[PDB]
């Protein structure tokens, strides 16, 4: 498999969206370029909460989910399983077995303007807590009182809240660019792979060989045996390779 996925263009966007409709990118059938550590989507925080991230290279990757959000600085550590909050539970919950790398830039020079930015919209009121990895887009006025919310009035609160940033605001209210590379498995769907090192072939010598999981010892010689294009292995009487 000789294919390369350009990771670098995926992670940065021209304009980041709101909480309501982000973008989810799935990556497969490509060489695992996770040496983009420290200079792209994994960087400064380097908070790979995955269970043994180096041993995840052995558990050969079947899907990669890449995401890029922008969240305020008061709740950077809120992206972890088991934590509560209105901006945590009613926006994005994580399952208890999250395996991946979730890393946050101090985005103060590109997500803040002198006139103020109003392109990031959040919720603080919802009917109930949602299932993890789910999104709601529909904008409806919730019923937060005895009065029926059929009109725009008191006890009927809009759920949309647009955060505001400038370079003059202090740390904690500044926007942070949080990028997620998550490598989990749904029910271990062992479908596609990548890491597969191959030594150079050697002929006419007594060597050990391993071809597609078949191990053995002997001498490999070119010959006039012909295979129809389905068949891969060869075998004879008494069932020896």
């Amino acid at each position: 498999v000789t294919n390369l996925c350009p990771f670098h263009e995926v992670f940065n966007a021209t304009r980041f969206a709101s909480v309501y409709a982000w973008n989810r990118t799935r990556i497969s059938n490509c060489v695992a370029d996770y040496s983009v550590l420290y200079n792209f989507a994994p960087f400064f925080a380097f908070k790979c909460y995955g269970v043994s991230p180096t041993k995840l290279n052995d558990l050969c990757f079947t899907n990669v989910y890449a995401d890029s959000f922008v969240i305020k600085g008061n709740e950077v550590s809120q992206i972890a399983p088991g934590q509560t909050g209105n901006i945590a539970d009613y926006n994005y919950k994580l399952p208890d077995d999250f395996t991946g790398c979730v890393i946050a830039w101090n985005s103060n020079k590109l997500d803040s303007k002198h006139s103020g930015n109003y392109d990031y919209w959040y919720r603080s009121f919802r009917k109930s807590k949602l299932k993890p990895f789910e999104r709601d887009i529909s904008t409806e006025i919730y019923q937060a009182g005895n009065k029926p919310c059929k009109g725009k009035g008191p006890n009927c609160y809009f759920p949309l809240q647009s955060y505001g940033f400038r370079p003059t605001y202090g740390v904690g209210h500044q926007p942070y660019r949080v990028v997620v590379l998550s490598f989990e498995l749904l029910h271990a769907p062992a479908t596609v792979c990548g890491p597969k090192k191959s030594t150079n072939l050697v002929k006419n010598k007594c060597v050990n060989f391993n071809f597609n999981g078949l191990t053995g010892t002997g001498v490999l010689t070119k010959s006039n045996k012909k295979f129809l294009p389905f068949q891969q292995f060869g075998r004879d009487i008494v069932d020896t390779t």
Epitope: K72, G116, Y157, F158, Q161, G170
Partner: nanobody, 129 residues
Framework: QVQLQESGGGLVQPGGSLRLSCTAS????????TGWFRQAPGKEREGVSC????????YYEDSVEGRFTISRDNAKNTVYLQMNSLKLEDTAVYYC??????????????????????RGQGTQVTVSS
């Protein structure tokens, strides 16, 4: 979309008291940060008080010290400014404005002049003998 309505005012005498109320219809208080700004005739607009999104953390100006109290009620979604010991130079028109996030005093940024998103019409408070 979202409107802010002010109430109160009248003819107060020096030594008296008055209470302004600012009611938001659409947006939610105790998640928004609201403040009071005033404008005297022949002058430029200057803030009075502010309260942030988190709890009831109050902020105040230099000529506002000790006489003016700010309180927010989340039941009626209406913020209250209580005026005590009004002096003769306090005749102005008062505006309430809201700005999402804990906007007032966030690092190297005070609530100087007006950059708030939501506005109102204003109520005239005059004081004289």
């Amino acid at each position: 979309q979202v409107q802010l309505q002010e109430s109160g005012g009248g003819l107060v005498q020096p030594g008296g008291s008055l209470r302004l109320s600012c009611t938001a219809s659409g947006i939610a208080l105790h998640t928004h940060a609201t403040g009071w700004f005033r404008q005297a005739p022949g002058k430029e607009r200057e803030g009075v008080s502010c309260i942030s999104s988190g709890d009831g953390t109050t902020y105040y100006e230099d000529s506002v010290e000790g006489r003016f109290t700010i309180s927010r009620d989340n039941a009626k979604n209406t913020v209250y400014l209580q005026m005590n010991s009004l002096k003769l130079e306090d005749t102005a028109v008062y505006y309430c404005a809201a700005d999402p996030g804990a906007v007032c005093h966030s690092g190297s940024y005070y609530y100087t002049d007006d950059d708030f998103y939501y506005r109102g019409q204003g109520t005239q408070v005059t004081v004289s003998s």
